[PDB]
Design a protein around this ligand. Structure first.
Ligand SMILES: *[C@@H]1O[C@H](CO)[C@@H](O[C@@H]2O[C@H](CO)[C@@H](O[C@@H]3O[C@H](CO)[C@@H](O)[C@H](O[C@H]4O[C@H](CO)[C@@H](O)[C@H](O)[C@@H]4O)[C@@H]3O)[C@H](O)[C@H]2NC(C)=O)[C@H](O)[C@H]1NC(C)=O
Ligand SMILES: *[C@@H]1O[C@H](CO)[C@@H](O[C@@H]2O[C@H](CO)[C@@H](O[C@@H]3O[C@H](CO[C@H]4O[C@H](CO)[C@@H](O)[C@H](O)[C@@H]4O)[C@@H](O)[C@H](O)[C@@H]3O)[C@H](O)[C@H]2NC(C)=O)[C@H](O)[C@H]1NC(C)=O
Ligand SMILES: *[C@@H]1O[C@H](CO)[C@@H](O[C@@H]2O[C@H](CO)[C@@H](O[C@@H]3O[C@H](CO[C@H]4O[C@H](CO)[C@@H](O)[C@H](O)[C@@H]4O)[C@@H](O)[C@H](O)[C@@H]3O)[C@H](O)[C@H]2NC(C)=O)[C@H](O)[C@H]1NC(C)=O
Ligand SMILES: *[C@@H]1O[C@H](CO[C@@H]2O[C@@H](C)[C@@H](O)[C@@H](O)[C@@H]2O)[C@@H](O[C@@H]2O[C@H](CO)[C@@H](O[C@@H]3O[C@H](CO)[C@@H](O)[C@H](O)[C@@H]3O)[C@H](O)[C@H]2NC(C)=O)[C@H](O)[C@H]1NC(C)=O
Ligand SMILES: *[C@@H]1O[C@H](CO)[C@@H](O[C@@H]2O[C@H](CO)[C@@H](O[C@@H]3O[C@H](CO)[C@@H](O)[C@H](O)[C@@H]3O)[C@H](O)[C@H]2NC(C)=O)[C@H](O)[C@H]1NC(C)=O
Ligand SMILES: *[C@@H]1O[C@H](CO[C@@H]2O[C@@H](C)[C@@H](O)[C@@H](O)[C@@H]2O)[C@@H](O[C@@H]2O[C@H](CO)[C@@H](O)[C@H](O)[C@H]2NC(C)=O)[C@H](O)[C@H]1NC(C)=O
Ligand SMILES: *[C@@H]1O[C@H](CO)[C@@H](O[C@@H]2O[C@H](CO)[C@@H](O)[C@H](O)[C@H]2NC(C)=O)[C@H](O)[C@H]1NC(C)=O
Ligand SMILES: *[C@@H]1O[C@H](CO)[C@@H](O[C@@H]2O[C@H](CO)[C@@H](O)[C@H](O)[C@H]2NC(C)=O)[C@H](O)[C@H]1NC(C)=O
Ligand SMILES: *[C@@H]1O[C@H](CO)[C@@H](O[C@@H]2O[C@H](CO)[C@@H](O)[C@H](O)[C@H]2NC(C)=O)[C@H](O)[C@H]1NC(C)=O
Ligand SMILES: *[C@@H]1O[C@H](CO)[C@@H](O)[C@H](O)[C@H]1NC(C)=O
Ligand SMILES: *[C@@H]1O[C@H](CO)[C@@H](O)[C@H](O)[C@H]1NC(C)=O
Ligand SMILES: *[C@@H]1O[C@H](CO)[C@@H](O)[C@H](O)[C@H]1NC(C)=O
Ligand SMILES: *[C@@H]1O[C@H](CO)[C@@H](O)[C@H](O)[C@H]1NC(C)=O
Ligand SMILES: *[C@@H]1O[C@H](CO)[C@@H](O)[C@H](O)[C@H]1NC(C)=O
Ligand SMILES: *[C@@H]1O[C@H](CO)[C@@H](O)[C@H](O)[C@H]1NC(C)=O
Ligand SMILES: *[C@@H]1O[C@H](CO)[C@@H](O)[C@H](O)[C@H]1NC(C)=O
Lengths: 390, 365, 258, 97, 49
């Protein structure tokens, strides 16, 4: 009110809003998988000279089923991260499957040194494929040594980017650390080049109910209270909307159940007080709010709480007599300062009851009069005002 | 909450616009207080809560259908319940409805007090202490007010009571049958609901932004672009709020005009007889009975209507002995052979005598 | 000629659930009382042409025993562009997006009781030649009421096919009826069946089924084309559309929509 | 602080804000003026019907039976002193039509 | 016809603003009906010429 003294009455103040308690995420376990399991895990790979190139589209690039492996030493992407892949969608993916010398794992990396690399696998200048290092000695090992994966490719002409050494007799487990055969796997994908046809995985968490929480259901983010509902969603229907087109029901992706969404309790806060001179005691009304949520006279406890159709009153004694209205509240409730002294909330009385002595043949006639001079004030005009707009 | 529901960044951006939110809240609070003031002015017009005696010997008039029925949990009369049944018909985004200060039960109590005061003390209770008077005598006073001699009522009391009872029954049947009578209240409710619905629907508009979802904008855009989009959304939603509040202010102004008219009708018809033509109903107003309806009032205007007009031959004065006699009150009428003097609103011929006429001038004028 | 088609033209907007809500939406619908072409599959004469796919198609038939097995979707149909193949057995469909080369008469062709009075499969042209492919999908081995049990015609295989922003969507619903004559009167909504992010994008489509002297075939199917329109749909308690109104059919419907 | 080519954007933002503020103020003034004009019409009617004559309308020129009224000028308004007659002491009697 | 007179692109851009223009049309139609209501109330007081 911008005043050090406030007159008797009830004044609106800062709105009361219930803050969320915890965050809840729900999603399906896992969806269809892109053909990455074979490239990242298989029995036989293609030849080094016949380096494989497979177009991957129309699937879900799920990194959960791919990152569950623990043999990788350092699988991180410079510009992105696997964890945030969940909501990242690809255009097309390319997989390079071949078996080469272990020491050539870095030779496959972009911006390398050595003419033995581009002889079999040229290094493009804009390769976004994140390098991956993993052990495949058992898979690439042969009892006598497999020399079929030779590096005879020695073309003299310069090699264009994607236009299409033999220090060991063969791939044998006897090779020392860093020299055993390794299968180089790189998931090289380009974005904004082909129509979006591949998307990422999702993550799930536990379930809670009957609390103001921030929910994320299949990418639908919101805040509210999740309750068990009797609505019967159709087998395919997921969300539910009200007349005003606002979310009101949601189907849990994990459990085939329907949950009602109710916005967290909120409402205006009014302060009922007599004149500052009369006393500094006040009561607080939370409008249209069950006072099972007011703890979250500003304190958790509500002293003598009093539920009323116009919200919950805190700090006002509930008197069960009737008087004339002093400070209105709502739904026929009025608060006033009375006798030690305290603020009392009661049901307003419309006036003294009267039973006129009406009868067959009884008439009441006055025998005297009074002259009453009563005032009446009416506004007639208000101050003129012109404005220089410019 | 409406503009920036649960968004610290959007709230911070909205802080720059100044006191628009405070102005809108103040306007809505003014309207809300004005509603309670309107109901108070219309209904709370009695210093005391009167009540009719148990013995309903009202000279044959039957007010059962308008008097309260204690049996029902809500002490509302038959017609009041009829109206309540006939009248028939967002929390997410900061929209709240505050209950009225005066509940339906207490409004019904006010109406019952007014009705009991009327039937038991005429119009005295509206001008001072309520003074009892038999309802037959009260109706005689009403007839004298409209200009018909009280002997008319005292001699046609049974017929008048039967006509009033039949009229009450007919109005009850009409209200029970057709719902078009309460179109005014239904339209008020529908307009308010439609305004709120449009306000809520406005939240699903881009206003040129990338999306209508603040959380989506924030998550998918970096500080600067998110700020630009959120500012666009803020402008759109603030325009929506201002439009809604202006419409509400105009509608509240018209509703206040209606409430003032209703209060004037109460004071000038229920609390007394009115000589203003077609103000308390069509015809010569005799009385009015109030009834409470959802978010409004209903007046049952009881009026007197001449029915069976018959012509006669009339003259302005009469020549007796060179002196021009004029009717004191009434008119001179003849059926063709004789001359009589009768009151102007009910054919009651009487012999023309010196006590019915006053002399003035002579014949030749 | 195209025969009468009163409404039989709306499937479902989306997944949302609405109860006792009259919702209006502007999408690709089959206009009410619009003309939908009619075909009779003659078993020399053979009714099986290649029809354009003008952004959505509606196919209604009462055939039994899966006489009309599946659909062919493509823009070249000559292995130059990947094409979709919707041939289905009672077990499951073999949905396949590949640069498949197509023959003039590429279907299984179980010509039973045609010219030999015996059940046999003369050809196997369902696979003409797979020169190159990009993806294939096999659906769950379901068991739908697509087989041959005549009784009284109750297999109204109303199907709606759409392609928007790289998504191919199929909606359908098995509607039992009692009038074996032309499409009877009623109301039914087609729940979605499949959504695919294929991204291939169709200019023409064909249905999959010299018999000189053989009796004329007994099989009929419709082909209607969708247009962009506004519709008003009446969701019931269960969120099922009991009725609909075309917001541009006539002034009365326009007023209802308004 | 800014080169005019980019300062024009800030100037436009300020102009839009201040213009919206002016429009809101003028709309509020129009509504308030309508309300005050209704009150002034009521006051003129009360003057005419109570000061310039005796009013039979109930509760118009004060509670009780109206006798007269006297006007008094107040800042931006008017004050009426409604004089009224009010019966005081009532006695029951037995009546007959 | 006023804001985006005969322009499909402008109409599509205006569609993003919600139902502002529908509200404006409703208000103007209400005023138009109220005019006839006023005339009827003022003049048509007797239904017997
Ligand atoms: C116009 O109105 C007057 C009022 O009625 C009417 O003149 C006569 O008035 C008297 C009563 O007001 C009527 O009743 C008559 O009363 C007399 C006693 O005064 C009776 O004697 C009458 O009985 C018969 O005998 C009379 C004397 O011989 C007759 O004159 C009379 O007609 C009866 O036959 C009777 O009860 C009376 O009927 C009328 N009329 C007459 C002639 O008295 C006058 O008739 C009205 N004019 C018209 C065209 O109706
Ligand atoms: C004043 O109130 C009513 C205003 O119309 C008068 O109408 C009376 O109401 C009902 C309607 O028939 C009748 O009964 C009255 O109401 C109930 C129920 O009535 C029962 O009896 C009637 C037969 O009389 C029967 O038809 C009904 O189905 C009920 O079984 C009871 O409280 C009383 O019976 C009461 O009389 C009256 O017949 C009806 N009367 C008339 C003239 O319409 C009512 O008469 C008035 N009350 C008084 C004391 O005058
Ligand atoms: C002045 O206008 C008033 C309009 O309300 C008249 O009051 C009512 O008018 C009707 C129409 O005549 C009167 O009906 C009565 O009918 C009887 C004949 O039938 C009556 O009796 C049977 C039983 O035997 C009963 O079932 C019927 O319903 C009738 O009640 C005539 O003999 C009467 O004269 C009279 O016409 C009503 O009686 C009358 N009162 C009510 C409550 O309706 C009024 O009659 C006119 N005044 C006159 C003509 O002097
Ligand atoms: C009463 O008012 C006049 C006058 O009637 C006479 O008035 C006095 C001068 C004395 O002589 C009285 O004794 C007498 O009643 C009547 O006006 C005319 O009455 C006739 C009916 O009687 C009207 O005709 C009626 O309506 C049409 C047109 O005539 C036809 O269907 C019939 O002819 C029917 O009778 C006539 O129109 C009317 N003159 C006009 C309108 O210019 C009056 O009718 C009578 N009123 C009543 C009984 O209600
Ligand atoms: C996602 O992962 C969880 C964990 O496995 C799956 O949850 C539940 O998995 C079991 C299958 O073993 C389903 O059967 C259930 O068995 C329990 C007894 O252990 C029984 O009490 C249940 O009534 C039910 O029959 C169970 O339905 C399933 N719960 C859900 C919500 O699915 C889950 O299946 C995986 N997929 C999804 C969509 O949740
Ligand atoms: C006048 O009216 C009522 C009742 O009438 C009188 O009752 C006796 C006391 C006696 O005065 C008789 O001559 C009259 O008939 C008096 O008080 C009311 O009485 C009725 C029941 O009798 C009761 O229902 C009311 O509640 C009483 N009070 C009222 C109507 O206000 C009253 O005292 C008498 N005197 C005056 C000045 O009113
Ligand atoms: C305010 O909240 C309390 C508790 O929610 C209500 O009391 C009931 O308590 C039981 C606990 O078993 C709940 O199951 C009920 O839901 C509660 N009833 C209701 C109506 O909520 C209390 O009644 C609520 N008060 C109001 C006015 O709604
Ligand atoms: C329907 O019956 C036929 C009988 O051959 C089968 O269809 C093919 O069966 C082979 C063998 O499994 C599959 O490779 C094909 O994909 C099937 N589809 C064809 C020919 O279009 C099969 O028994 C049933 N069709 C199925 C399972 O798709
Ligand atoms: C939704 O559909 C169900 C159908 O079961 C309705 O619930 C009732 O279930 C009983 C089971 O015997 C049926 O006999 C009734 O026909 C169903 N009632 C109705 C009106 O269809 C339910 O009422 C429908 N609406 C809901 C659940 O909100
Ligand atoms: C599958 O790949 C992962 C990581 O590349 C690895 O942990 C695992 O050893 C591989 N399995 C086999 C049989 O190579
Ligand atoms: C104190 O406040 C009350 C409010 O009603 C007022 O009646 C009283 O005059 C005030 N007294 C002083 C000394 O301010
Ligand atoms: C509260 O209401 C009950 C009703 O039975 C009553 O017994 C009690 O006296 C009331 N308390 C007060 C302080 O009036
Ligand atoms: C649409 O169907 C009716 C049915 O006979 C036909 O008369 C009409 O010609 C058809 N529309 C056109 C453009 O042919
Ligand atoms: C009989 O069977 C063969 C293949 O089995 C088929 O090609 C032919 O159409 C059928 N009718 C004949 C040969 O007349
Ligand atoms: C098939 O088509 C794709 C894209 O046109 C191409 O990358 C691939 O090499 C082709 N494969 C064969 C076997 O033709
Ligand atoms: C079909 O062909 C066009 C030509 O560019 C292609 O761009 C478009 O993606 C296609 N339509 C769809 C949904 O793919």
């Amino acid at each position: 009110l911008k005043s050090f003294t406030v007159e008797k009455g009830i004044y609106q103040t800062s709105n009361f809003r219930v803050q969320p308690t915890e965050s809840i995420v729900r999603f399906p376990n896992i969806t269809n998988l892109c053909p990455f399991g074979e490239v990242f895990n298989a029995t036989r790979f293609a030849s080094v000279y016949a380096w494989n190139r497979k177009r991957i589209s129309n699937c879900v690039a799920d990194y959960s089923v791919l990152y569950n492996s623990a043999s990788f030493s350092t699988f991180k992407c410079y510009g992105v991260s696997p964890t945030k892949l969940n909501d990242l969608c690809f255009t097309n993916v390319y997989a390079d499957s071949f078996v080469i010398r272990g020491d050539e794992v870095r030779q496959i990396a972009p911006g390398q040194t050595g003419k033995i690399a581009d002889y079999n696998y040229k290094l493009p200048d804009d390769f976004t494929g994140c390098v991956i290092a993993w052990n495949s000695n058992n898979l690439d090992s042969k009892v006598g040594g497999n020399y079929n994966y030779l590096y005879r490719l020695f073309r003299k002409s310069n090699l264009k980017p994607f236009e299409r050494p033999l220090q060991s007799y063969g791939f044998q487990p006897t090779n020392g650390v860093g020299y055993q055969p390794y299968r180089v796997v790189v998931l090289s994908f380009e974005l904004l080049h082909a129509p979006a046809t591949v998307c990422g995985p999702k993550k799930s968490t536990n379930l809670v109910k009957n609390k103001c929480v921030n929910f994320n259901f299949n990418g639908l983010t919101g805040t509210g209270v999740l309750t068990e509902s009797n609505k019967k969603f159709l087998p395919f229907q997921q969300f539910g909307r009200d007349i005003a087109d606002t979310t009101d029901a949601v189907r849990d992706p994990q459990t085939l159940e329907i949950l009602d969404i109710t916005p967290c309790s909120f409402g205006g806060v009014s302060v009922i007080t007599p004149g500052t001179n009369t006393s500094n005691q006040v009561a607080v009304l939370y409008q249209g709010v069950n006072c099972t949520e007011v703890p979250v006279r500003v304190y958790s406890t509500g002293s003598n709480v009093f539920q009323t159709r116009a919200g919950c009153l805190i700090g006002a004694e509930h008197v069960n007599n009737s008087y004339e209205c002093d400070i209105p509240i709502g739904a026929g409730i009025c608060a006033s300062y009375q006798t030690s002294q305290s603020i009392i909330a009661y049901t307003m009385s419309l006036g003294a009851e009267n039973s006129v002595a009406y009868s067959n043949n009884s008439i009441a006639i006055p025998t005297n009069f009074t002259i009453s001079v009563t005032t009446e004030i009416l506004p007639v005009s208000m101050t003129k005002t012109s404005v220089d707009c410019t | 909450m409406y503009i920036c529901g649960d968004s610290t960044e959007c709230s911070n951006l909205l802080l720059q616009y100044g006191s628009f939110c405070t102005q809108l809240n103040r306007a809505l609070t003014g309207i809300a207080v004005e509603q309670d003031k309107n109901t108070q002015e219309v209904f709370a017009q009695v210093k005391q809560i009167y009540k009719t005696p148990p013995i309903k010997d009202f000279g044959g008039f039957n007010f059962s259908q308008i008097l309260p029925d204690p049996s029902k949990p809500s002490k509302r009369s038959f017609i009041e319940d009829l109206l309540f049944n006939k009248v028939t018909l967002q929390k997410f985004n900061g929209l709240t409805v505050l209950p009225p200060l005066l509940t339906d039960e207490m409004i019904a109590q006010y109406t019952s007090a007014l009705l009991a005061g009327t039937i038991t003390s005429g119009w005295t209770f509206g001008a001072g202490a309520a003074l009892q008077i038999p309802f037959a005598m009260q109706m005689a006073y009403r007839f004298n007010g409209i200009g018909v001699t009280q002997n008319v009522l005292y001699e046609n009391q049974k017929l008048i009571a039967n006509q009033f009872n039949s009229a009450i029954g007919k109005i009850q049947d009409s209200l029970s049958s057709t719902a078009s009578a309460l179109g005014k209240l239904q339209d008020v409710v529908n307009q308010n609901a439609q305004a709120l619905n449009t306000l809520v629907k406005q939240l699903s508009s881009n206003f040129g932004a990338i999306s209508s979802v603040l959380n989506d904008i924030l998550s998918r855009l970096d500080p600067p672009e998110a700020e630009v989009q959120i500012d666009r959304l803020i402008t759109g939603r603030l325009q929506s709020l201002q439009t809604y509040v202006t419409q509400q202010l105009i509608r509240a102004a018209e509703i206040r005009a209606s409430a003032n008219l209703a209060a004037t009708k109460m004071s000038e018809c229920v609390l007394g007889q009115s000589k203003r033509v077609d103000f308390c109903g069509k015809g010569y107003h005799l009385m009015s009975f109030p009834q409470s309806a959802p978010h409004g009032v209903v007046f049952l205007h009881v009026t007197y209507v001449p029915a069976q007009e018959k012509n006669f031959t009339t003259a302005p004065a009469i020549c007796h002995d060179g002196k021009a006699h004029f009717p004191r009150e009434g008119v001179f009428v003849s059926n063709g052979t004789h001359w009589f003097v009768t009151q102007r609103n009910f054919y009651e011929p009487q012999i023309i005598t010196t006590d019915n006429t006053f002399v003035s001038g002579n014949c030749d004028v | 000629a195209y025969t009468n088609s009163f409404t039989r033209g709306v499937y479902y907007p989306d997944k949302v659930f609405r109860s006792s809500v009259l919702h209006s939406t502007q999408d690709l619908f089959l206009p009410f009382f619009s003309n939908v072409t009619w075909f009779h599959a003659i078993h020399k004469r053979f009714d099986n042409p290649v029809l354009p796919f003008n952004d959505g198609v509606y196919f209604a038939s009462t055939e039994k025993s899966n006489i009309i097995r599946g659909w062919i979707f493509g823009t070249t149909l000559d292995s130059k562009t990947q094409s979709l193949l919707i041939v289905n057995n009672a077990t499951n469909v073999v949905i396949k997006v590949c640069e498949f080369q197509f023959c003039n008469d590429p279907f299984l062709g179980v010509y039973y009781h045609k010219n030999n009075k015996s059940w046999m499969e003369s050809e196997f042209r369902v696979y003409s030649s797979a020169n190159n492919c990009t993806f294939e999908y096999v659906s769950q081995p379901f068991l739908m009421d697509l087989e041959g049990k005549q009784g009284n015609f109750k297999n109204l295989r109303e199907f709606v096919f759409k392609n928007i922003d790289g998504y191919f969507k199929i909606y359908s619903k098995h509607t039992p009826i009692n009038l074996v004559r032309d499409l009877p009167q009623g109301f039914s909504a087609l729940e979605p069946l499949v959504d695919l992010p294929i991204g291939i994008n169709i200019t023409r489509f064909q249905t999959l089924l010299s018999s000189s002297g053989w009796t004329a075939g007994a099989a009929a199917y419709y082909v209607g084309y969708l247009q962009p329109r506004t519709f008003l749909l009446k969701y019931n308690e269960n969120g099922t559309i009991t009725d609909a109104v075309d917001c541009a059919l006539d002034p009365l419907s326009e007023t209802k929509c308004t």
